[PDB]
Write a protein that binds this ligand. Sequence first.
Ligand SMILES: *[C@@H]1O[C@H](CO)[C@@H](O[C@@H]2O[C@H](CO)[C@@H](O)[C@H](O)[C@H]2NC(C)=O)[C@H](O)[C@H]1NC(C)=O
Ligand SMILES: *[C@@H]1O[C@H](CO)[C@@H](O[C@@H]2O[C@H](CO)[C@@H](O)[C@H](O)[C@H]2NC(C)=O)[C@H](O)[C@H]1NC(C)=O
Lengths: 376, 376
Amino acid sequence: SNSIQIGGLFPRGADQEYSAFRVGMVQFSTSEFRLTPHIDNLEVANSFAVTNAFCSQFSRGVYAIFGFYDKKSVNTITSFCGTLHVSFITPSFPTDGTHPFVIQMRPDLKGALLSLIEYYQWDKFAYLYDSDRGLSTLQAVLDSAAEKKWQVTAINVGNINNDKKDETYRSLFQDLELKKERRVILDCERDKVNDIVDQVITIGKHVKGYHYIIANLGFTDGDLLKIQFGGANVSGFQIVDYDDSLVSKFIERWSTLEEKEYPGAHTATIKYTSALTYDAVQVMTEAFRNLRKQRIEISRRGNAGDCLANPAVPWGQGVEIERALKQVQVEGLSGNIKFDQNGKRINYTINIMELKTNGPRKIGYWSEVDKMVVTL
Amino acid sequence: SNSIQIGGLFPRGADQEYSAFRVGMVQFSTSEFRLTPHIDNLEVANSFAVTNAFCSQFSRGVYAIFGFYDKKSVNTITSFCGTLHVSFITPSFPTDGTHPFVIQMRPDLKGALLSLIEYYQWDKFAYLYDSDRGLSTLQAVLDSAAEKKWQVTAINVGNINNDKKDETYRSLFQDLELKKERRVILDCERDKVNDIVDQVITIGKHVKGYHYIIANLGFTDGDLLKIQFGGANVSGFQIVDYDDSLVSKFIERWSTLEEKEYPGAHTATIKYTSALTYDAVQVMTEAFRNLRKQRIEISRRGNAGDCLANPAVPWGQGVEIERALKQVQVEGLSGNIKFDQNGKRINYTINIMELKTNGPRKIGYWSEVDKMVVTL
Ligand SMILES: *[C@@H]1O[C@H](CO)[C@@H](O[C@@H]2O[C@H](CO)[C@@H](O)[C@H](O)[C@H]2NC(C)=O)[C@H](O)[C@H]1NC(C)=O
Ligand SMILES: *[C@@H]1O[C@H](CO)[C@@H](O[C@@H]2O[C@H](CO)[C@@H](O)[C@H](O)[C@H]2NC(C)=O)[C@H](O)[C@H]1NC(C)=O
């Protein structure tokens, strides 16, 4: 048997991620033990919902929770996890701090972004953002601006009501035009980028003389073809490397999976959040394997009880499970996976990309310790 | 014997605010009914703690909750209140959105601040912000910077370990001794403002040629006397007008209370947060009084239950309570109190202040519809 109960907290509509999760469950299945996921699908921005689901898993008796949060709900997660010693493994944006009991699959992007800016020798640009992943990056660029004498125009595009969102664009570009802004960073939710890209194309700002940096880890995850021929420079970041044999092999299978059975999966690419979901199954699997290999018993003796029991007394095995997960080092879709004591990715690589007439191309990479290295 | 129960969620050090709350309960109590508060003292930044306390008050069957939140716990409050139709009345920062079931006693400060900056005809300035407290008003000035043609140098003053503090704050100003920054916006809690004022004085930057804008609603809550004679301009905002008889008559009383019975309350001034709290007791009282004047029965028949009951079916009378709360229009320590449909203060007034050798003086006022008006 060896059935190991875990929770799965999935946003509604995260079909590809859940398909990647199930493929991960197949890939990393083993006779040693079985991960036994209990799945909740919910509105990840709704803290009540996230608390209900967390507590429901907790009372069932899970040994770890894999899932997602939003900026509206990250504090529910870090606070419940930290209080009860339950480990959360997530592909979402890294928490802004050193919160314990959170294993963060997603590498920090800020460093690479700052180096890229320096690399193109920008000292004046617009930073167009929303806040769904917090404001860490905004702070990082403001700090750099002050320190390197950059003139940054930083504008929150997150709050343009899509119910009348067009006069709002003209006024945005009017503001940008005041200083003839031509270098632009887009750090937004993926549909937000696409909205902004259409908006740019429409007013002819996708021509030569413009240069956009897409500040996310999935440059090729969405539709680049529409700005591929206008003449503007377009650059970005990619944590999933389709030239890795490991990734290449996975895509051979992924690309042929039955779409009815694996929604989101009959394609040549996989979104980085889905790749990280797949990699998370490997990490959890290795953690429980390592514990068993170390002869560390983590089996629950009694019921977890109510997540709101007062006083909140953390189970003693919590720390053990946190440590096992943080000590995992493996190779996955997102390259070398290793964590520091705070569950943040270290020793990872981010590929730096440029859009060219013949498609997106790697021009080099950013190293978690060597910064930006061009490929010759 | 008409006991309407309510909750009070008080941050673990909010002594003066609790004193203010207890005073308002006396001032506004009546033979009609007695608000019967149940009080929790808690780590307001701890979302788990906040959920526990909310759920504990929900189970008791309170008819509303007066309380405080933090930027880390605000989502817990809005989600739980919005889901369960439990009204939260608070002097905390207004929410970033139109969340329902939240009565925000504190007026928005962004308009007045943006207006004041324009008034002084600033184009280049430093903005000291406190990440602990939030970035919301910084963002508003960053959004506006293009259209209003400003060059903003934003510095985070928010992760200072009190160990150093002195050294950090001096390093900060001896760094603004680079771009020749002399116009500085504060945007901090009154304590952090005091700390900074203390260091500006020690560094000798409170002289003529520097100008500080304190971006909180309590210009005279702190000690201005010490920076009054240096020669620097110092401007701020004030919502509690001590020239009003209502306020003067209140302070007559407040200055008299025994400090042992009412911590924080043997003084001439009163923090705008405590004033908003006193005001909150009037609003809650009027709302529930008005529900009776309209023979809207709101008495719960059966137990409220568990905040984690599933499915979540909100009680029928929540919406009536919310509406009654939002329909209240009274005059209080913070001036005319009125709310829109999203529980935000409307038709309120913010006084504009400058520090003079003879003390703080009102120089004008800011209105929702008139914007900035020089007084004469
Ligand atoms: C788009 O990329 C091009 C190519 O690097 C940039 O043009 C180069 O950059 C410098 C600075 O303007 C020029 O002096 C070089 O001569 C350019 N190289 C070549 C061969 O074209 C250009 O600056 C980028 N666009 C924007 C708006 O930043
Ligand atoms: C402090 O306040 C004064 C008045 O608002 C600022 O401007 C003074 O008044 C006029 C109006 O521009 C100027 O022509 C004078 O030169 C200013 N007076 C003096 C003696 O400086 C003044 O600039 C403010 N100080 C700062 C640093 O903003």
